[PDB]
Amino acid sequence: SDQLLIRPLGAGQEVGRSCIILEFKGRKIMLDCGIHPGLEGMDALPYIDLIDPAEIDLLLISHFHLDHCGALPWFLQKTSFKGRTFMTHATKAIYRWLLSDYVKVSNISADDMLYTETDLEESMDKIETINFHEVKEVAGIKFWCYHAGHVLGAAMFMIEIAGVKLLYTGDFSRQEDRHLMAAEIPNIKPDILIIESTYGTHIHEKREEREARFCNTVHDIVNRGGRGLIPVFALGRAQELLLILDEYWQNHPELHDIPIYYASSLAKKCMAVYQTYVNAMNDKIRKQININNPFVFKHISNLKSMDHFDDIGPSVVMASPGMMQSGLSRELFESWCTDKRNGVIIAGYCVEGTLAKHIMSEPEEITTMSGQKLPLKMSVDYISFSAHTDYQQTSEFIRALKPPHVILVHGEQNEMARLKAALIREYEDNDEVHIEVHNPRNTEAVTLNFRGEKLAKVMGFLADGQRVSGILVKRNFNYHILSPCDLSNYTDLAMSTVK
Amino acid sequence: TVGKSSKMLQHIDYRMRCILQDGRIFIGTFKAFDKHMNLILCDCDEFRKREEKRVLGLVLLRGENLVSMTVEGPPP
Amino acid sequence: AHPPELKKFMDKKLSLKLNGGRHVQGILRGFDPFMNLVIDECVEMATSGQQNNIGMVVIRGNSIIMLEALERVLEHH
Amino acid sequence: MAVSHSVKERTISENSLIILLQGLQGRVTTVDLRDESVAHGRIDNVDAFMNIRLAKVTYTDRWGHQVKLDDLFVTGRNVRYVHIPDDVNITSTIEQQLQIIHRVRNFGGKGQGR
Amino acid sequence: VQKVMVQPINLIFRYLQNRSRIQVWLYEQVNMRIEGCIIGFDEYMNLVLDDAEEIHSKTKSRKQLGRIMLKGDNITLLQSV
Amino acid sequence: TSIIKLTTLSGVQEESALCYLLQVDEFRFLLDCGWDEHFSMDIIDSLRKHVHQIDAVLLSHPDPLHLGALPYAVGKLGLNCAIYATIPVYKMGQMFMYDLYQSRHNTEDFTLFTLDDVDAAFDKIQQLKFSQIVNLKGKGHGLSITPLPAGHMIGGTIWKIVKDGEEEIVYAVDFNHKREIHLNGCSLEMLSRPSLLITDSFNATYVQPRRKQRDEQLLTNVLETLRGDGNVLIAVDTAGRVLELAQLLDQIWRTKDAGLGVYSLALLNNVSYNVVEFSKSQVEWMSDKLMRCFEDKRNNPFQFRHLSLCHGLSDLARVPSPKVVLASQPDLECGFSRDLFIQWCQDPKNSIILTYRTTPGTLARFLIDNPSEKITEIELRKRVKPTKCISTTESIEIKARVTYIDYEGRSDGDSIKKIINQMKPRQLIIVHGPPEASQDLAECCRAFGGKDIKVYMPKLHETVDATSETHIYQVRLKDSLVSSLQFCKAKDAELAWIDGVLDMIPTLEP
Amino acid sequence: LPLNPKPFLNGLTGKPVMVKLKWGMEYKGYLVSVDGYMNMQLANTEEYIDGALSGHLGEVLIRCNNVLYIRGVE
Amino acid sequence: SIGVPIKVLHEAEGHIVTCETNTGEVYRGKLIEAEDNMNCQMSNITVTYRDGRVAQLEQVYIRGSKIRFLILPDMLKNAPMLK
Amino acid sequence: MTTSERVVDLLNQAALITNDSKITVLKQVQELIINKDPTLLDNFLDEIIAFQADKSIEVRKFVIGFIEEACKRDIELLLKLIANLNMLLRDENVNVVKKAILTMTQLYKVALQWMVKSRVISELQEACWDMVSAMAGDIILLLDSDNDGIRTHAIKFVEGLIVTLSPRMADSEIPRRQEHDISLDRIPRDHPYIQYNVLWEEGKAALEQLLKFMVHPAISSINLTTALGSLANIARQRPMFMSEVIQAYETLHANLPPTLAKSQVSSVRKNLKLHLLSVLKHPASLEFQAQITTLLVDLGTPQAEIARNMP
Amino acid sequence: PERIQRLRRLMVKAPRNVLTRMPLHEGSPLGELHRCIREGVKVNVHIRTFKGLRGVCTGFLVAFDKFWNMALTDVDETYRKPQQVFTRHINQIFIRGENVLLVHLA
RNA sequence: UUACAGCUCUUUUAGAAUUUGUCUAGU
RNA sequence: CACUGAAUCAGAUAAAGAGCUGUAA
Ligand SMILES: [Zn+2]
Ligand SMILES: [Zn+2]
């Protein structure tokens, strides 16, 4: 009746398996349910057992990453959930193929699977789509999503339950991109901000200085006759890297002979989403759609497998997976690591325990998938393309809104705690702004009080310091107090008379 | 035909002694190939069989007619 | 597997050289992507020079070494 | 050992007897050619189309003239005999190579390499 | 006037309807010619002949065969007699 | 008690344009300004004196009947105010005006609005989305703006003005309740009982056939003409309803068992490539059936594999000789829809399929009703001299098979009248349509409505003081809601009889 | 009514055939089974070289690319 | 895409080449068009038979599988693809 | 460009396409010579039927659909296109024979009606009908075929064979699409070539093959529920065999095959309820309400759903 | 641990290598040549020359292929070089099936 | 509730038969 | 330190299955 409980069932002091229960005035909203990409089996789910799925009203999925939408076919189908779920239009068209790839990679793993693809396709009919900036209402909950950046189709779900306005940002970026826009500062100031804390107090190299260091790296590999391997994820930053290299070769006539490839069957199936949803781009592409689609490439083709192309002369092939576990981005490496002319460009990120993190220490000799040991002599360059916010972009985002209560999710415990320590000492000097930052872990609820005056309206015959008597209607939270006569004028049901 | 297991790029621009099915021996600068062993050999030699030598030049050799390739020497 | 470009030889008088020293002439009427020819008014030129009208034939394309043109055939650039 | 980096080229091998003579890469064999020439060297990286890239051969012409070479590359169609060595046990070196392809085709996952 | 082309699978199939005696010339075998009547043909030009006979050009012998199945790899021409 | 008044500047008694001026308490919403087909100046002089008492121009459906005057009202008349329109009104309504200028610039010296006025009117426009509540900031403070889907053209809107309170002033013109192929229908249930509804009566007396019944007679007319070796001219829009027929045709030209693909679709606009290129970018603006077939099978539904698009008469002649061309303009007044009419109306083996019912002073209204043959009509050319335009008149002897097949997406009179009856608007006006059909809608909403509906049929340059008193004052419940039971919106869940004192903003004490 | 070559061999299994190879070799015997490439398994096979008996072989499995014609003999 | 030597053969369309077939005949002449499967249309042919003679022809068309090797012109060795 | 030069260009094009994408070009040749200009069908008939000897299986299935659409446009062409339809019925593929049984379903009623409109017949037309009736009797023998799909389409052929070869009555309920199709009442008995008494026993000998096919123990599931609907079509359209269909319904209801599982036994039990409910409205079924209403109780049908459909 | 059982209360192909294609081909001539693998029948393979016959290999059969490629072990090859019969013994051989003529059985 | 076309998927099997991936020239 | 990937061979093999969309009853 009075309290608001934000209970992180996932991504509380960790990265992955995001889930947030939002309980306020009888309505429960579960925000952005995903799996943990570093666990196995049923352990990768959020702590869904701390609630019952039969009384969750909304389900707002921010974007299409597996730590944000991955546990969803388990939840919409294999549980007792009967509420309404919402995505953006560009999230759902990548969701169906991003997760069709998930149950193909989790098929060659242990057979304690969460769901299958026939359970994925029958989840597509239960998912409704919110467009950007549009106010949808479910059980008295207005909610409207902003452009979050960071991927094509992400969303910052503003939520308004009885005048309490909350913002879940998901994973957002605030730098202008080749195909994305910055995270929108709303014109409506929220009372509660639930924000990512992915980096804390780190910093980025500047965007004009990364794309120059990237294009000089690709160009120096193909000038020495070498092959360019760019291991990257299929969907996150592969599409942005492509815009850079295609533009860079319109500006250079001598590089037209050699070719640029992208080698993924997931980026093939999801390239049509980048060609269609141009309204979820930034203003730079949707004014360049007047001439031609920039995701219909002029010098970049798909590579189905490495049997198809002859390895004659220089080439730039950006294959997937990004951290080079297996697949085509690993066999293109093993075919190219025994030559000094070739060069690998680690454009994405790495995790301790993968081949893309082991290569950065420059080992003298790497291990083939078949157990053979090949001498690593190709050049290794690490050029970050984060698509997140550092401290100078998170603190600028939080000065512009000034929320009274800030809840940190989606960050590891050492980098989330350094972000809370920096946000407290940034607002402990000035007196007119007061921010109460929280970093709750899993299952730890955040109790917030939002007592507000209840306002009604007389507009019927009672509308003309006297007494007020009559029947009162509460729609969801909006009150109206009316005459006994005015139930056939305003209210759907006019009267009740028995004899 | 040739797949990528037999690295034909090892001997590119070398001097390759190519023996044909009829018995003729081509010795020329190995310029380019494909997935059918179409050999572009440059500044060729034609050794029939006592044995006579002919200067050919730029010979495209159809890969049906190739028996054995061996290295005559380094790139001149 | 692209078909042959033998449309320039349609309704032209060919002079085929098959394998084994066998040599036929006549007028082409059609083909296929296996280069199997149909030769109307086909004349068998034997080894002794004796000509033999053999009607119209189906010649399997596996055994066609060379086909010259006894009439003028269009050329490209 | 070493397998191909091509799914097109390792599945022709996995479905055929070629995976036999890829199991004896490194052993000195004798490859009798189709035109009755003899090549006797060390097999290195025979592909899915039996293009044998021998290492150090006492290559014999079909007229009998031995010209000792230091690399030789046999075309797949110009093969008739691959004299495999004595200590091979055919059905085991096939099952070893099928084990090597089976660990390249699956090969683990994420967070488990190091 | 452009005529529709006579494809080779038409004219073999034309011999099948007509029940017409053909005389096959052989691939790299000049002396012998099989001479039969097509009862059926295949995707790969495998001819099922009938009352077939080997026609040796030097022996001038006509060895009666009967209901044979000539394979497609051996045909170099299909004369109609 | 807001002073809500609207003046019909044009668009009533079958002057089939639209331009309205709905005042809300000294905030002059200019609803939906548009020219007619032949550019009369009876709206331009009616908008000279209202171009400075103006703010928040609310557009609608992308076509020159709803946004045609806007390049002239901005480039010449000089209105500097917000123009609220959704994204397909922005991108297809810009596409109509590039095919309204250039379709007359190929025939005559057309200098009413230039293309620099199309760009100027379509840059100072705020792209919205459906159900995007836009709170106005300025001299209209309590007014919020909400476009809702209408379903006539792509991104076609009804609006929902909401004053601070519940004064709900929905403007729903030319809507469509049915779910067609590339659009889903209009809702009109998120709005429940408004304070004013501004609806049309253009089809209030029209008995519309079934959509399945008139897809057959299109296919019968298209096939029988082509089997008889003859071309088909189809007069459609350039971006609005051409997307319905090019999706209606191409799913028939794909999914019939016969070899239909020998008969050469075309699509003649001056800007036709950008029509299909933008419609394959607004897939989130289209029908749910048409959207689900993209999110599950990665085929863009406007990736046509039979529509051979053409930009002019030079590009049209390089297709095979029987062809089905859907023309630029729905009236046969300008563009290639007139040029292809004159070239093959003299040949009996050709068909001419008019799909949209235009303004009554047009050549395409002359062919829908009163079918005559030996008639006189002007011919506008432009010869090479640098060029110069030629005007000449001819007698053409129409002997092709002219047929009107109704492919305008609008509701019929049993559903444009059922929705107003299923709603309960406390005030109604009836704002365009003939006087024969406005009375047929007025004498059912007054009849099968309540005692307090008060429908209107305003004439031209007639204002209507449609402001009704339901005085509203905002009382906040002070102490207790505990002794009551607080029932809900769905049904009689509880009962919430409440008495109380006031304290004069005021409160409620027991 | 036409009789295609795949129904021809399937109606000839178990019967005495006489497979003539491409270079005069000729093998009569009981055709046991054939496959899609028309490999010809023959049982009780005796070899006719130059039209004369050479020797009773036994069971003979002729590869596809050697057969000139198969002939139903009686 | 097709390989480099087929593209190198297409860059010799319009020059005098030498073609030797499987049967031993050597075909010296201007080649007009070559295909991806090495079907070579040629013109103004000087032939050299297996027994050894000289005849001169006008226009031929050689099956691509019946070509043993092609002698491209010595001008063409400075192609942009062979570098 | 002329249609008789567009068809030639589309046949030079369809003769060089190797894969199964030639039928997009080749169905365009169909629509130009049977719909746009039907006078060219006599000219290009010998070049479309040449594609029935094709390597692909959908090209020779085009020829089966082409002969169906050319004999319904010109039935005089059946004198040539019936020698080319049995060798598509004797084809070794099994999707090709299933299409050849669909075409013989429509082109038997039309072939028989063409034989009786001709008051005088020719000896070349005599060679056509005894070749249609020979291949109509071979589809009866394809009830013993080892494919599930050949048996399914042959059941739908013999229901088009029994109804065609058995006469109408006053209570023969025939739908509006099957109205002008031939029956055995509008046959001539003084006809020169075809005989009434031959086709009289031919219609019931094809019934006996359909009946003993259903009491077979190893009958498949979808072959059964197609045969149940085929006995219901030869009862409502032919009330002469009303005493025989109900005897075959109760034999199957007392003796279900044990080979099909319970998830498809209940699909047989559901669809048998639908056809006995639909045969009850027919006025020749009032004689046998002691058998139909007895069987519907065992299927689990209440009395209200039986008493609502009584005419 | 225990949490997986709290989440399960809210719930309201074969390999195709070369050796698995060995026991197939049973209704074909190749699958009868698989009985020589099982029963251990001495297999004497005829080997083609360029045109005709070259020799007979006569070895126990191990592990054949689709292409008639096969690995004979106890080989005693009697061949003819282009009449001088030279027989030589091979302890394990690989014969590719392009060169085989007909598989005689003993 | 049946039958045909249109695209997206699942097991079984093919991917050894005419211009290069399993030989009538190796003269 | 930011969250998964060419499913055991060719851009078209063949049987048996599936689901959606449309149109014919
Ligand atoms: Zn993310
Ligand atoms: Zn995340």
GROMACS .gro file of N, CA, C and O (backbone and C1' of nucleotides) in nm, chain D residues 11-21 48 50 94, chain G residues 35 37 39 61 63, chain J residues 16-25 28-34 37 61-72 94-98 100 103, chain K residues 14-16 22, chain L residues 9:
model
  259
  663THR      N    1   3.499  -3.366  -4.383
  663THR     CA    2   3.385  -3.456  -4.391
  663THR      C    3   3.385  -3.543  -4.515
  663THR      O    4   3.318  -3.647  -4.516
  664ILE      N    5   3.456  -3.503  -4.620
  664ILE     CA    6   3.492  -3.599  -4.724
  664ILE      C    7   3.585  -3.704  -4.666
  664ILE      O    8   3.575  -3.823  -4.697
  665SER      N    9   3.675  -3.661  -4.577
  665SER     CA   10   3.768  -3.753  -4.514
  665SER      C   11   3.700  -3.845  -4.414
  665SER      O   12   3.725  -3.966  -4.415
  666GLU      N   13   3.612  -3.790  -4.331
  666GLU     CA   14   3.546  -3.868  -4.227
  666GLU      C   15   3.454  -3.975  -4.285
  666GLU      O   16   3.434  -4.080  -4.223
  667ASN      N   17   3.401  -3.952  -4.404
  667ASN     CA   18   3.307  -4.043  -4.468
  667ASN      C   19   3.373  -4.139  -4.566
  667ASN      O   20   3.303  -4.206  -4.642
  668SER      N   21   3.506  -4.147  -4.567
  668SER     CA   22   3.576  -4.223  -4.669
  668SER      C   23   3.703  -4.282  -4.610
  668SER      O   24   3.740  -4.254  -4.496
  669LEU      N   25   3.768  -4.365  -4.691
  669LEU     CA   26   3.891  -4.435  -4.654
  669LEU      C   27   4.014  -4.347  -4.651
  669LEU      O   28   4.120  -4.390  -4.608
  670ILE      N   29   4.001  -4.225  -4.700
  670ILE     CA   30   4.114  -4.135  -4.702
  670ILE      C   31   4.161  -4.113  -4.559
  670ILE      O   32   4.281  -4.107  -4.534
  671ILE      N   33   4.068  -4.102  -4.465
  671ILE     CA   34   4.105  -4.084  -4.325
  671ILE      C   35   4.200  -4.194  -4.279
  671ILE      O   36   4.263  -4.181  -4.174
  672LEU      N   37   4.213  -4.302  -4.357
  672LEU     CA   38   4.313  -4.404  -4.328
  672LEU      C   39   4.453  -4.348  -4.348
  672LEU      O   40   4.534  -4.343  -4.255
  673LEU      N   41   4.483  -4.303  -4.470
  673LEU     CA   42   4.617  -4.257  -4.503
  673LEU      C   43   4.645  -4.116  -4.455
  673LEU      O   44   4.758  -4.069  -4.471
  700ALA      N   45   4.162  -3.442  -4.872
  700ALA     CA   46   4.043  -3.521  -4.898
  700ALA      C   47   4.034  -3.570  -5.041
  700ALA      O   48   3.943  -3.647  -5.073
  702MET      N   49   4.319  -3.695  -5.203
  702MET     CA   50   4.431  -3.789  -5.213
  702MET      C   51   4.552  -3.725  -5.280
  702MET      O   52   4.637  -3.793  -5.337
  746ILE      N   53   4.236  -4.556  -3.810
  746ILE     CA   54   4.112  -4.492  -3.852
  746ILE      C   55   4.037  -4.439  -3.730
  746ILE      O   56   3.994  -4.324  -3.728
 1392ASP      N   57   2.287  -5.169  -5.743
 1392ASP     CA   58   2.257  -5.046  -5.671
 1392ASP      C   59   2.234  -4.932  -5.771
 1392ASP      O   60   2.221  -4.954  -5.891
 1394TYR      N   61   2.426  -4.694  -5.876
 1394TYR     CA   62   2.532  -4.677  -5.973
 1394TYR      C   63   2.547  -4.797  -6.066
 1394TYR      O   64   2.634  -4.794  -6.153
 1396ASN      N   65   2.643  -5.110  -5.999
 1396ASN     CA   66   2.740  -5.214  -5.969
 1396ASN      C   67   2.671  -5.349  -5.981
 1396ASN      O   68   2.558  -5.365  -5.933
 1418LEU      N   69   3.213  -5.913  -5.841
 1418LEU     CA   70   3.153  -5.784  -5.810
 1418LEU      C   71   3.212  -5.680  -5.904
 1418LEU      O   72   3.319  -5.625  -5.876
 1420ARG      N   73   3.266  -5.333  -6.089
 1420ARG     CA   74   3.249  -5.190  -6.067
 1420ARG      C   75   3.171  -5.128  -6.182
 1420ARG      O   76   3.168  -5.182  -6.293
 1841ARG      N   77   2.830  -4.067  -3.812
 1841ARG     CA   78   2.821  -4.108  -3.951
 1841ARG      C   79   2.959  -4.112  -4.015
 1841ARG      O   80   2.981  -4.058  -4.123
 1842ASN      N   81   3.054  -4.177  -3.950
 1842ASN     CA   82   3.191  -4.182  -4.000
 1842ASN      C   83   3.203  -4.290  -4.108
 1842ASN      O   84   3.103  -4.342  -4.159
 1843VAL      N   85   3.326  -4.324  -4.146
 1843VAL     CA   86   3.347  -4.424  -4.250
 1843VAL      C   87   3.314  -4.564  -4.199
 1843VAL      O   88   3.265  -4.649  -4.274
 1844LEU      N   89   3.331  -4.589  -4.069
 1844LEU     CA   90   3.311  -4.722  -4.016
 1844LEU      C   91   3.165  -4.755  -3.990
 1844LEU      O   92   3.129  -4.873  -3.986
 1845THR      N   93   3.079  -4.655  -3.971
 1845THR     CA   94   2.936  -4.681  -3.962
 1845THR      C   95   2.870  -4.701  -4.097
 1845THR      O   96   2.758  -4.753  -4.103
 1846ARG      N   97   2.935  -4.661  -4.206
 1846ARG     CA   98   2.889  -4.694  -4.340
 1846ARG      C   99   2.938  -4.830  -4.385
 1846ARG      O  100   2.901  -4.875  -4.494
 1847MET      N  101   3.022  -4.895  -4.305
 1847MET     CA  102   3.060  -5.033  -4.333
 1847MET      C  103   2.942  -5.130  -4.322
 1847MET      O  104   2.916  -5.201  -4.421
 1848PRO      N  105   2.866  -5.138  -4.212
 1848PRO     CA  106   2.760  -5.241  -4.207
 1848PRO      C  107   2.637  -5.209  -4.291
 1848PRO      O  108   2.544  -5.290  -4.294
 1849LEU      N  109   2.634  -5.094  -4.358
 1849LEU     CA  110   2.528  -5.059  -4.452
 1849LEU      C  111   2.554  -5.124  -4.587
 1849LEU      O  112   2.626  -5.224  -4.594
 1850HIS      N  113   2.489  -5.072  -4.692
 1850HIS     CA  114   2.499  -5.117  -4.831
 1850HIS      C  115   2.446  -5.258  -4.850
 1850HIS      O  116   2.483  -5.323  -4.948
 1853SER      N  117   2.301  -5.427  -5.187
 1853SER     CA  118   2.389  -5.372  -5.290
 1853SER      C  119   2.508  -5.465  -5.302
 1853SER      O  120   2.529  -5.552  -5.217
 1854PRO      N  121   2.587  -5.453  -5.410
 1854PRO     CA  122   2.711  -5.532  -5.416
 1854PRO      C  123   2.815  -5.493  -5.311
 1854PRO      O  124   2.894  -5.579  -5.272
 1855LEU      N  125   2.816  -5.368  -5.265
 1855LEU     CA  126   2.915  -5.326  -5.167
 1855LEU      C  127   2.894  -5.391  -5.031
 1855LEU      O  128   2.992  -5.417  -4.959
 1856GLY      N  129   2.770  -5.418  -4.992
 1856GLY     CA  130   2.746  -5.480  -4.863
 1856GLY      C  131   2.773  -5.629  -4.860
 1856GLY      O  132   2.793  -5.684  -4.751
 1857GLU      N  133   2.772  -5.695  -4.975
 1857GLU     CA  134   2.822  -5.831  -4.981
 1857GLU      C  135   2.972  -5.835  -4.961
 1857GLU      O  136   3.025  -5.933  -4.907
 1858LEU      N  137   3.042  -5.730  -5.003
 1858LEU     CA  138   3.184  -5.714  -4.979
 1858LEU      C  139   3.215  -5.677  -4.834
 1858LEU      O  140   3.332  -5.678  -4.795
 1859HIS      N  141   3.112  -5.647  -4.754
 1859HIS     CA  142   3.128  -5.636  -4.609
 1859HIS      C  143   3.126  -5.771  -4.540
 1859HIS      O  144   3.172  -5.782  -4.426
 1862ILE      N  145   3.475  -5.868  -4.472
 1862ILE     CA  146   3.525  -5.809  -4.348
 1862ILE      C  147   3.490  -5.900  -4.231
 1862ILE      O  148   3.574  -5.929  -4.145
 1886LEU      N  149   4.056  -5.874  -4.678
 1886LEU     CA  150   3.995  -5.743  -4.696
 1886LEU      C  151   3.965  -5.679  -4.561
 1886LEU      O  152   3.909  -5.743  -4.472
 1887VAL      N  153   4.004  -5.552  -4.547
 1887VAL     CA  154   3.978  -5.471  -4.428
 1887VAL      C  155   3.926  -5.335  -4.476
 1887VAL      O  156   3.990  -5.272  -4.561
 1888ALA      N  157   3.811  -5.292  -4.422
 1888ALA     CA  158   3.767  -5.153  -4.425
 1888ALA      C  159   3.749  -5.092  -4.563
 1888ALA      O  160   3.839  -5.022  -4.609
 1889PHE      N  161   3.642  -5.124  -4.636
 1889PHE     CA  162   3.621  -5.066  -4.768
 1889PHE      C  163   3.555  -4.927  -4.760
 1889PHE      O  164   3.540  -4.869  -4.652
 1890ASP      N  165   3.513  -4.875  -4.875
 1890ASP     CA  166   3.466  -4.738  -4.891
 1890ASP      C  167   3.353  -4.737  -4.994
 1890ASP      O  168   3.325  -4.839  -5.057
 1891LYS      N  169   3.286  -4.622  -5.008
 1891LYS     CA  170   3.185  -4.604  -5.113
 1891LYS      C  171   3.247  -4.619  -5.251
 1891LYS      O  172   3.191  -4.685  -5.339
 1892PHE      N  173   3.363  -4.558  -5.271
 1892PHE     CA  174   3.430  -4.546  -5.399
 1892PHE      C  175   3.498  -4.673  -5.444
 1892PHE      O  176   3.577  -4.665  -5.539
 1893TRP      N  177   3.473  -4.786  -5.376
 1893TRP     CA  178   3.543  -4.914  -5.387
 1893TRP      C  179   3.690  -4.904  -5.345
 1893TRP      O  180   3.770  -4.991  -5.378
 1894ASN      N  181   3.726  -4.797  -5.272
 1894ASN     CA  182   3.855  -4.792  -5.206
 1894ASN      C  183   3.856  -4.896  -5.096
 1894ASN      O  184   3.757  -4.912  -5.025
 1895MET      N  185   3.969  -4.965  -5.079
 1895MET     CA  186   3.976  -5.072  -4.980
 1895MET      C  187   4.119  -5.103  -4.944
 1895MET      O  188   4.210  -5.087  -5.025
 1896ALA      N  189   4.137  -5.150  -4.821
 1896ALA     CA  190   4.268  -5.175  -4.760
 1896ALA      C  191   4.287  -5.325  -4.744
 1896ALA      O  192   4.254  -5.383  -4.640
 1897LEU      N  193   4.342  -5.389  -4.846
 1897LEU     CA  194   4.378  -5.529  -4.838
 1897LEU      C  195   4.503  -5.546  -4.753
 1897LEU      O  196   4.595  -5.464  -4.760
 1919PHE      N  197   4.691  -5.017  -4.960
 1919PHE     CA  198   4.571  -4.937  -4.982
 1919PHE      C  199   4.549  -4.925  -5.132
 1919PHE      O  200   4.633  -4.867  -5.202
 1920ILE      N  201   4.438  -4.978  -5.181
 1920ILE     CA  202   4.402  -4.969  -5.322
 1920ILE      C  203   4.288  -4.871  -5.334
 1920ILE      O  204   4.183  -4.890  -5.272
 1921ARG      N  205   4.306  -4.766  -5.414
 1921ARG     CA  206   4.193  -4.678  -5.437
 1921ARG      C  207   4.103  -4.735  -5.545
 1921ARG      O  208   4.148  -4.803  -5.637
 1922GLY      N  209   3.974  -4.708  -5.531
 1922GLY     CA  210   3.874  -4.776  -5.609
 1922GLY      C  211   3.856  -4.729  -5.750
 1922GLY      O  212   3.776  -4.787  -5.824
 1923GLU      N  213   3.927  -4.624  -5.790
 1923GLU     CA  214   3.929  -4.584  -5.930
 1923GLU      C  215   3.992  -4.691  -6.017
 1923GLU      O  216   3.952  -4.710  -6.132
 1925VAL      N  217   4.017  -5.033  -5.945
 1925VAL     CA  218   3.969  -5.170  -5.931
 1925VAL      C  219   3.879  -5.203  -6.049
 1925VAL      O  220   3.813  -5.116  -6.107
 1928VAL      N  221   3.579  -5.729  -5.815
 1928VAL     CA  222   3.619  -5.794  -5.691
 1928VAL      C  223   3.575  -5.940  -5.701
 1928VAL      O  224   3.458  -5.973  -5.683
 1945A        P  225   2.343  -4.313  -4.794
 1945A      O5'  226   2.309  -4.288  -4.947
 1945A      C5'  227   2.397  -4.214  -5.028
 1945A      C4'  228   2.325  -4.113  -5.112
 1945A      C3'  229   2.413  -4.013  -5.183
 1945A      O3'  230   2.463  -4.066  -5.303
 1945A      C1'  231   2.233  -3.901  -5.079
 1946G        P  232   2.613  -4.120  -5.308
 1946G      O5'  233   2.688  -4.005  -5.383
 1946G      C5'  234   2.771  -3.921  -5.308
 1946G      C4'  235   2.746  -3.776  -5.337
 1946G      C3'  236   2.858  -3.686  -5.290
 1946G      O3'  237   2.964  -3.677  -5.383
 1946G      C1'  238   2.657  -3.608  -5.200
 1947A        P  239   3.097  -3.763  -5.357
 1947A      O5'  240   3.126  -3.834  -5.496
 1947A      C5'  241   3.035  -3.928  -5.551
 1947A      C4'  242   3.107  -4.031  -5.632
 1947A      C3'  243   3.034  -4.084  -5.753
 1947A      O3'  244   3.043  -3.996  -5.863
 1947A      C1'  245   3.141  -4.261  -5.638
 1953U        P  246   3.471  -3.799  -5.840
 1953U      O5'  247   3.606  -3.876  -5.872
 1953U      C5'  248   3.638  -3.915  -6.005
 1953U      C4'  249   3.688  -4.058  -6.011
 1953U      C3'  250   3.579  -4.164  -6.008
 1953U      O3'  251   3.621  -4.275  -6.088
 1953U      C1'  252   3.724  -4.196  -5.825
 1967C        P  253   2.751  -3.161  -4.398
 1967C      O5'  254   2.863  -3.145  -4.510
 1967C      C5'  255   2.975  -3.061  -4.489
 1967C      C4'  256   3.031  -3.016  -4.620
 1967C      C3'  257   2.928  -2.998  -4.730
 1967C      O3'  258   2.863  -2.873  -4.720
 1967C      C1'  259   3.114  -3.119  -4.813
   0.00000   0.00000   0.00000
